[PDB]
Amino acid sequence: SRARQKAAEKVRDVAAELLDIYAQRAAKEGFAFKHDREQYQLFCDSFPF
Amino acid sequence: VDALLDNGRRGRAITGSNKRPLKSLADMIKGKQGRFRQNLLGKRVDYSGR
Amino acid sequence: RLVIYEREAPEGTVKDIKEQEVYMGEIPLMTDNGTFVINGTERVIVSQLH
Amino acid sequence: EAILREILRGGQVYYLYNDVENIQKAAERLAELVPEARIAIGHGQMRERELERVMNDFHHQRFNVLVCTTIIETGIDIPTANTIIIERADHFGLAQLHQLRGRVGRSHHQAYAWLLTPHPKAMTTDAQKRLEAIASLEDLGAGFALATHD
Amino acid sequence: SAAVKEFFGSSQLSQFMDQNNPLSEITHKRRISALGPGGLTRERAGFEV
Amino acid sequence: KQVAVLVPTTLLAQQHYDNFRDRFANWPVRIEMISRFRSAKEQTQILAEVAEGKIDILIGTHKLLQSDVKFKDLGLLIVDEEHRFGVRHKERIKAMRANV
RNA sequence: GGAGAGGUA
DNA sequence: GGGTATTCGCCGCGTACCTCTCCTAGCCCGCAAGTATCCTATTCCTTGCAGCGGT
DNA sequence: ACCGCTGCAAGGAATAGGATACTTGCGGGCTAATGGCGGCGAATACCC
Structure with missing residues (x-):
């Protein structure tokens, strides 16, 4: 019987913080990576398939 | 789309709750409660008594 | 009354048996006349012939 | 007959019950149902030492049928296991239904998968939609559209 | 409780009294109905019954 | 760019450690893991060294998202076996670096 | 908004 | 093959009004996973002193 | 005689156990029909 009811919630909001991190992502710019043909190809060579 | 135009023309008919199938664009035209027989059936009227 | 057969012994023996007044159901009572008072209304079941 | 079909193939069976309080009883309930299978318990x-013993002895084929909770969902090896029997597929999330269907297989052997249902009108309507979705799609490449069913 | 309350509440037989007499009570407590569960149908009975 | 790997169990981390180490068998990259199976004395050097950063590839459970791990230059998040992790654990790493 | 019981004509 | 009688299930089942009663559904807590900390206690590992060896 | 080696006291150390708080799923409890006729397609089986 000791499984009745009455636990509350919403001790901490999420929505503002999710909007914050999403805005922070959409504000700054991501990193433009650099690609090497033959260096990546030697890594492809390590793939035995 | 085949459920939209006429749900239940297939053997499988998608529903909502309590296993009653949804009304489709057939169902407001199909049968004894559609838009076809309702004007032909009895419509209650104003200015009347009993 | 619950009977528990003890597993170690052969088929049909008694480990222990318990008993308590379990409650199940609220059956309506007929009044002194014939009426079953169901929801403040006063219903009567008619005898069916089948 | 599912258990027999698997054991006279020679592999092992994942039989999952997913309730630890009665898995001990369900073990013998399965065990005198199939007297020639070898059943151990894992959950x-x-x-946290007998579990590893059970899984390693399973890994060394010392017994055939393993009664288990959804611990097997962590995706262990041993492809000799080739048959999932979910005893009560009523209450199980559809994504991990697909995941458990991924557990058997891993072999050129044809794996099998029986999803036991309760009586159809007893169950939740949502469970029926889930089971119709999983009975519709049995292919490779069907994992994603099954998530569109989720 | 659900099974007995469904029958006593909502059946074809547990019906509402006519109480506007003593006669109508005492002859609604002796009605021999041939309808309801396990019986024949209002619209689907011949001239013989 | 200090690749960070996240999985939601110890076992998947354990296969991933083998996969990463065996595939990166010829390049100057140091790859490690962390979980509850690692001792604290190993944790206290691995996570500290993450700030120093010769480990470039790091694998683990939620232990990464324990508000103490400080990547010196995070450039890649890879997360495996998605349908776990709530939302908070999913974006708690991106909270460290907005344009990761 | 539906199903069921009645009752009148 | 192919005309042809034949039966069987699936689905239609026939005015107007009045009275009264029955109707289901979302969610909190439980279950199973899984993961993290946190003490605790509890054994385990490692070290340092007590005491005999001897040739 | 005195370090050299050993056996035991201890102390810390590490680790199981059993708490707590977090995620996924999902359900369970719980408040909030066997008294009928007709048409027609299906499905015949039936004789050709």
């Missing part, structure tokens, strides 16, 4: 709430 996540043991003392």
Whole structure:
């Protein structure tokens, strides 16, 4: 019987913080990576398939 | 789309709750409660008594 | 009354048996006349012939 | 007959019950149902050494049928296991239904998968939609559209 | 409780009294109905019954 | 760019450690893991060294998202076996670096 | 908004 | 093959009004996983002193 | 005689156990029909 009811919630909001991190992502710019043909190809060579 | 135009023309008919199938664009035209027989059936009227 | 057969012994023996007044159901009572008072209304079941 | 079909193939059976309080009883309930299978018990709430014993002895084929909770969902090896029997597929999330269907297989052997249902009108309507979705799609590449069913 | 309350509440037989007499009570407590569960149908009975 | 790997169990981390180490068998990259199976004395050097950063590839459970791990230059998040992790654990790493 | 019981004509 | 009688299930089942009663559904807590800390206690590992060896 | 080696006291150390708080799923409890006729397609089986 000791499984009745009455636990509350919403001790901490999420929505503002999710909007914050999403805005922070959409504000700054991501990193433009650099690609090497033959260096990546030697890594492809390590793939035995 | 085949459920939209006429749900239940297939053997499988998608529903909502309590296993009653949804009304489709057939169902407001199909049968004894559609838009076809309702004007032909009895419509209650104003200015009347009993 | 619950009977528990003890597993170690052969088929049909008694480990222990318990008993308590379990409650199940609220059956309506007929009044002194014939009426079953169901929801403040006063219903009567008619005898069916089948 | 599912258990027999698997054991006279020679592999092992994942039989999953997913309730630890009665898995001990369900073990013998299966065991005198199939007297020639070898049944051991494994679940996540043991003392964290017998579990590894059970899984390694399973890995060394010392017994055939393993009664288990969804601990097997962590995706272990041993492809000799080739048959999932979910006893009560009523209450199980559809994504991990697909995941458990991924557990058997891993072989050129044709794996099998029986999803036991309760009586159809007893169950939730949502469970029926889930089971119709999983009975519709049995292919490779069907994992994603099954998530569109989720 | 659900099974007995469904029958006593909502059946073809547990019906509402006519109480506007003593006669109508005492002859609604002796009605021999041939309808309801396990019986024949209002619209689907011949001239013989 | 200090690749960070996240999985939601110890076992998947354990296969991933083998996969990463065996595939990166010829390049100057140091790859490690962390979980509850690692001792604290190993944790206290691995996570500290993450700030120093010769480990470039790091694998683990939620232990990464324990508000103490400080990547010196995070450039890649890879997360495996998605349908776990709530939302908070999913974006708690991106909270460290907005344009990761 | 539906199903069921009645009752009148 | 192919005309042809034949039966069987699936689905239609026939005015107007009045009275009264029955109707289901979302969610909190439980279950199973899984993961993290946190003490605790509890054994385990490692070290340092007590005491005999001897040739 | 005195370090050299050993056996035991201890102390810390590490680790199981059993708490707590977090995620996924999902359900369970719980408040909030066997008294009928007709048409027609299906499905015949039936004789050709």
